[PDB]
Design a binder for this molecule. Structure first.
Ligand SMILES: *[C@@H]1O[C@H](CO)[C@@H](O[C@@H]2O[C@H](CO)[C@@H](O)[C@H](O)[C@H]2NC(C)=O)[C@H](O)[C@H]1NC(C)=O
Ligand SMILES: *[C@@H]1O[C@H](CO)[C@@H](O)[C@H](O)[C@H]1NC(C)=O
Ligand SMILES: *[C@@H]1O[C@H](CO)[C@@H](O)[C@H](O)[C@H]1NC(C)=O
Ligand SMILES: [Cu+2]
Ligand SMILES: [Cu+2]
Ligand SMILES: [Cu+2]
Ligand SMILES: [Cu+2]
Ligand SMILES: [Zn+2]
Ligand SMILES: [Zn+2]
Length: 497
């Protein structure tokens, strides 16, 4: 692991995580990137050093620390042309921020175009030495972070028009693609019999959700997207792009090898044929062999409606629909080629939105592209409904700068104004669903809200929450290096970008 103070080199390398060799964009030269870590309260100083040379996957980059509120450090959030210009190759940029009020499972990823799909994504954990769930498990460390990643044999920027589908699922960086004549290497999570582990499960994919289970073991879910939850023991869960769950794995079964199953909603092959979409849970002492186990009846799946925060955390505003200061029904649509939010497809501006603000924008209405701006008042309760229906999912919608109470989840008619889950990525489901969330505006600056299916983001599925803009410049003082980003980036030719 690295951090809270570390360099992060961003490099090109050729890899074959599912047996197929291809070039990639890799944090620390590995897929996934190294685990970045710290304790609650730490100052992260992550010096991102861009050494990219392959134009096909972009040589510039920009990193976002997914789920961190970045209060007073909006400039370190990462989204290209919202919070910064991309870092240029041959240069570095220091993301310098604190995590005073969060402890949980997070991750980091490129937030420039579709680059994270090409490999730049890794896990990031903020440990709590006073974690109230500490007494539920024995081991919680780098070995217990588990990433679920889609993987594509075509480079992201070379993907043809229309729906993109992954070639394989990589668990902790390995997995099999369909069609192999000799099976490639499976990831192995090794466990000691009688030991309880906190598995920190992260879906770092560009697209699929995974129906996840472990043969012969139940999962006791204790965290969702950074926020500790009441324990809920389940037979499987479904985890969308960008979401996290911690669960307790109790290694209480006989010594053996057990299949960890991560079944993507969409991919070249969604089955477990040939041990694809799988990894191995190996008890110490078990043979170096594949599991021979089978999945159970799956009678108690995790349902988002059932997840409750560990610390009771009431819903702000009044406990009825529209009971908040600013209330908006977000209309997501697809026009045949592009996504739109409230009839506008996101087009990144040449001047990043925070630079527009520091250059003198008085308010949200000065910001461009104006059609993608939602002004939010300061110190208020916000309620967004986001009815499902637009093609492509199953859309995991994510808000930057905030997490939110999920009043109403997909596939549920329930409005919970009492003790809904708090998270930062939520599936909006499909036509008939009306996921509804609330959050509070205690964080001035421009914050992205977007679908976390990266292909949909590229096709414009995004809007900017322009929060307390009159205070945003003063609330987010920037370092000199951040002022040099746009001059360096704009000096490049198209395309040496
Ligand atoms: C999703 O929920 C929103 C919020 O309740 C619904 O929009 C509201 O609908 C009521 C009932 O017609 C109106 O009186 C409100 O003015 C609307 N609120 C807002 C902020 O627009 C919306 O209709 C629901 N959509 C679906 C598809 O169920
Ligand atoms: C859809 O919207 C995009 C983005 O505004 C526009 O350029 C495109 O031509 C539209 N496609 C169709 C089929 O209208
Ligand atoms: C909705 O939930 C029910 C019961 O919890 C489940 O059986 C069903 O498969 C779900 N429906 C959809 C459309 O996802
Ligand atoms: Cu993200
Ligand atoms: Cu994020
Ligand atoms: Cu989407
Ligand atoms: Cu994002
Ligand atoms: Zn492919
Ligand atoms: Zn103005």
């Amino acid at each position: 692991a690295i951090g809270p103070v570390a360099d992060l080199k961003i490099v090109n390398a050729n890899i074959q995580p599912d047996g197929f060799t291809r070039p990639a964009v890799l944090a620390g030269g590995t897929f996934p990137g190294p685990l970045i870590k710290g304790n609650k309260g730490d100052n992260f100083q992550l010096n991102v050093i861009d050494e990219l040379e392959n134009e096909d996957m972009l040589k510039s980059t920009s990193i976002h620390w997914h789920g961190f509120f970045q209060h007073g450090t909006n400039w370190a959030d990462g989204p290209a042309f919202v919070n910064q210009c991309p870092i240029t190759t041959g240069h570095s940029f220091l993301y310098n921020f604190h995590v005073p009020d969060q402890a949980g499972t997070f991750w980091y990823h490129s937030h420039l175009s579709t680059q994270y799909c090409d490999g730049l994504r890794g896990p990031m954990v903020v440990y709590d030495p006073h974690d109230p769930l500490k007494q539920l498990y024995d081991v919680d460390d780098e070995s217990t972070v588990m990433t679920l990643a889609d993987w594509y044999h075509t480079l992201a920027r070379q993907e043809p028009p229309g729906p993109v589908t992954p070639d394989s699922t990589l668990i902790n960086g390995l997995g099999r693609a369909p069609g192999q004549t000799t099976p490639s290497e499976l990831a192995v999570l090794t466990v000691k019999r009688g030991t309880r582990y906190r598995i920190r499960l992260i879906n770092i994919s560009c697209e699929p959700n995974y129906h996840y289970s472990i043969d012969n073991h139940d999962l006791t879910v204790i965290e969702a997207d950074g926020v500790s939850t009441q324990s809920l023991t389940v037979s499987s869960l479904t985890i969308f792009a960008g979401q996290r769950y911690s669960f307790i794995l109790n290694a209480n079964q006989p010594v053996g090898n057990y299949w960890i199953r991560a079944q993507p909603n969409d991919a070249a092959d969604v089955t477990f044929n040939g041990g694809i979409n799988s990894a191995i849970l190996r008890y110490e002492g078990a043979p170096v062999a594949e599991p021979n186990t089978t999945a159970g009846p799956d009678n108690t799946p995790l349902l988002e409606v059932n997840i409750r925060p560990f610390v009771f955390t009431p819903v702000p505003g009044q406990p009825h629909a529209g009971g908040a200061d600013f209330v908006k029904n977000l209309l997501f649509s697809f026009n045949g080629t592009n996504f739109q939010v409230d009839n506008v497809s996101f087009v990144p501006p040449t001047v990043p939105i925070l630079l527009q603000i520091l250059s003198g924008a008085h308010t949200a209405q000065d910001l461009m592209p104006a059609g993608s701006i939602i002004p939010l008042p300061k110190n208020a309760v916000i309620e967004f409904s986001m009815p499902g229906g637009v093609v492509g999912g199953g859309h995991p919608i994510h808000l930057h700068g905030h997490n939110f109470w999920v009043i109403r989840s997909a596939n549920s008619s329930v409005y919970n104004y009492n003790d809904p889950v708090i998270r930062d990525v939520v599936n909006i489901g499909t036509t008939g669903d009306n996921v509804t969330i609330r959050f509070e505006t205690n964080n001035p600056g421009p914050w992205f809200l977007h679908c976390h299916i990266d292909w949909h983001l590229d096709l414009g599925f995004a809007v900017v929450m322009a929060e307390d803009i009159p205070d945003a410049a003063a609330a987010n003082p920037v370092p000199a290096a951040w002022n040099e980003l746009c001059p360096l980036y704009d000096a490049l030719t198209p395309g040496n970008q």
